[PDB]
Amino acid sequence: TTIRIQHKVAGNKLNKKLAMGIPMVRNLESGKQVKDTANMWMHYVDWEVE
Amino acid sequence: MVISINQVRQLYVAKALKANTAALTTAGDIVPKADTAKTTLYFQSMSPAGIVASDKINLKHVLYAKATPSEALAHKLVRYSVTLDADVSATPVAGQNYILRLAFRQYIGLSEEDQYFKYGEVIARSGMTASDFYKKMAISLAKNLENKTESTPLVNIYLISAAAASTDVPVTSATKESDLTATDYNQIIIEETEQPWVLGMMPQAFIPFTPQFLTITVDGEDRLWGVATVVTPTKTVPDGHLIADLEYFCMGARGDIYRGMGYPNIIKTTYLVDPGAVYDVLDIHYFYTGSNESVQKSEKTITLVAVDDGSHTAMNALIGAINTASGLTIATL
Amino acid sequence: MVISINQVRQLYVAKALKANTAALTTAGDIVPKADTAKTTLYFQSMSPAGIVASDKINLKHVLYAKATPSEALAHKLVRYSVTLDADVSATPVAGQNYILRLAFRQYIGLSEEDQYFKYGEVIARSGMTASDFYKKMAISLAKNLENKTESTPLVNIYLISAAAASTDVPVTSATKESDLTATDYNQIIIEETEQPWVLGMMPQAFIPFTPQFLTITVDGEDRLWGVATVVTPTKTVPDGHLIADLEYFCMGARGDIYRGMGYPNIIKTTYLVDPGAVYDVLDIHYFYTGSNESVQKSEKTITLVAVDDGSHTAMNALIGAINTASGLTIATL
Amino acid sequence: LMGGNTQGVPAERLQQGERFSIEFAPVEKELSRKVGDVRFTSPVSMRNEW
């Protein structure tokens, strides 16, 4: 079987530092459930894309 | 018959026409399905293994939709009409050997370099007539071209009596001048013969030929005795063998590409084309374009083949169906 | 007349409209050609060297197609009327130097935007009336701008007498008050001029102007005396020279791009536009899209010229033929 | 009409001879599509004799 995914971003998000950030329940490989914050919106996009 | 595809081609046999998805009882039943707001078109076909639908066609992204009849795919066999040149001499020469040469162009191999020559020799005699010479020439060609030991059929050879002027008298390697009882033979026809065929292994091909002549001394000068001429064909190889390979090919896009590789461990595909029939074809070219950046086209083809009863009833009914459901106009043939 | 192109422009001269390809005998003969299904349109034109065919237009890819009346491409010649305002004084005031200025937006030989002036001096005395002032101001202007010394003035000067009110009285660098014997001169008109034109070297171009008046003291107050009003033009500049240049440039898209560069070693192209005639233009913008993965458009245009004889007869027939062939709905002139 | 206009432009400003000039090519900050173009000019030549 074959799987695909995509996501379009406007180029003005290159280094759009976020005002307050976005806290998140992010999970690591096994030692997961690490709460992290997204200062740049790209980090948040990258994490959910993966 | 491996073919070229504009990124895909798919085939559906329209054995019957049912008008409802409910009436798809047996294989080969097909229904064109398009909403009232004519934006999509597809075909619900009954497979040997259950219902199945075809890719949906955007009636806005359709490029060409055309039906081709059976006769359009019937290869007319090239037939020459070789006679002796009334310029050199309207009759044979007393003591000359007339050696007719048939150079065959595409012999076993694909290339035009794969040449093969077959000869017919006739030494003329005083008092010999033209009819009698055609008789002997055709018989020599028979023994060389219509023999039984030849690996593959090469040509058919005939004779025509001026009285008939249209009837062609077969001359096989069994024939003999006792069986050819006439005096008004005008020419020797040499026709192209259908080569063998195998589903998926030997595509429908032919081997063409040109008749060449050797030179005789007519007074004291080497000259050619014959004039080879192309006359209208009268035989045609029917479509049944092309459509079958087309299906043997286009069904590997909708399914198994390992047609037979893995002999015990394979997946057999039942087909609905009988190579002993004559189908009319219908092809629709269309494409899919994406959104906001994926504008590159994906041109695609959906072909439907229906048997011709001689007046194109199955296809014309199929055409009326697609035209009344899609608003299209596909020029009934 | 180098122009901007949407990747190409091609020009063909419709010197004569013929019904069939066989009637193309003289250079300039043209016929619109389209199939019966109206899938493509092309033009067969007789060049000095045989008939040439235009690009083929896929009639689904036509962006726009409009024709012009040859009056849109004509340039009216701007002309003002100069007059001393009755507010300051309805008659010249003695002792004051009246200096008129003509503010040109380009130089005579250049096209870059600059400020370029020409002047006219008159010094008023106790008895000088309006007529004598216009007279002496006109002669001063002529001697100052018609110092061409090679070719021709930059603007043309005339005088209008109150009796005529419509008969422009020309004034040149040779004119002298003895030639101007009227006493009812009431204004001065200053028209634009048709500057030199060369086929592919000097484009048709004009130099607008504005009559500006310097300041005089009337009652101890510096004031402006003049009234530079814009009367309606009466002369025109047709497009013959403008079209001829279009051909000269657009014939390098199917012909030789060099034109006199390696002067001894050149190719010389024969041009069918008659500078001196007035052509009404037609244009068809279309594009080529392409195949899978090749959606990028190659937009193009084919324009056609035809002489106008008042009524746009030639072009009206040409488009009527094109609408009859390609089914388009181009509008008549 | 750009510039926040809600009333239009008088015809007087839209008559034969009104000369125009290029200012700039503004776009969006998000998802901008190509716009603009550059310009070229040719020289002339003068000659004199000895």
Curated annotation (Swiss-Prot), chain A:
Disulfide bond positions: none
Name by which UniProt lists this protein: Major capsid protein
Note, other: Displays an HK-97-like fold with an insertion domain that protrudes at the capsid surface.
Subunit comment: Interacts with the auxiliary capsid protein (via FD region). Interacts with the head fiber dimeric protein. Interacts with the head fiber trimeric protein. Interacts with the portal vertex auxiliary protein.
Species in which this protein is naturally found: Bacteroides phage crAss001
Location in the cell: Virion
Function: Capsid protein self-assembles to form an icosahedral capsid, with a T=9 symmetry, about 77 nm in diameter. Each asymmetric capsid nonamer is covered by 9 capsid auxiliary protein, 1 copy of the trimeric head fiber protein and 2 copies of the dimeric head fiber protein.
Swiss-Prot record, chains B, C:
Location(s), subcellular: Virion
Cellular component annotations (GO), alphabetically ordered: viral capsid, decoration
Protein keywords: Capsid decoration protein, Capsid protein, Virion
Primary residence: virion
Region feature FD, mapped onto this chain: 75-237
Keyword ATP-binding: no
Presence of the UniProt keyword RNA-binding in the record: no
Disulfide bond sites: none
Function: Auxiliary capsid protein that forms an outer layer on the major capsid protein protrusions.
Record comment regarding domains: The central region FD is structurally similar to Helicobacter pylori flagellar cap protein FliD.
Subunit structure: Interacts (via FD region) with the major capsid protein.
Descriptive protein name: Auxiliary capsid protein
Protein's organism: Bacteroides phage crAss001
Swiss-Prot record, chain D:
Superkingdom of source: Viruses
Subcellular location: Virion
Miscellaneous remark of the record: Displays an HK-97-like fold with an insertion domain that protrudes at the capsid surface.
Oligomeric and partner information: Interacts with the auxiliary capsid protein (via FD region). Interacts with the head fiber dimeric protein. Interacts with the head fiber trimeric protein. Interacts with the portal vertex auxiliary protein.
Role noted for this protein: Capsid protein self-assembles to form an icosahedral capsid, with a T=9 symmetry, about 77 nm in diameter. Each asymmetric capsid nonamer is covered by 9 capsid auxiliary protein, 1 copy of the trimeric head fiber protein and 2 copies of the dimeric head fiber protein.
Protein name: Major capsid protein
Organism in which the protein naturally occurs: Bacteroides phage crAss001 (Bacteroides phage PhiCrAss001)
Lineage of producing organism: Viruses, Duplodnaviria, Heunggongvirae, Uroviricota, Caudoviricetes
Full-protein interval shown: 153 to 202 of 504
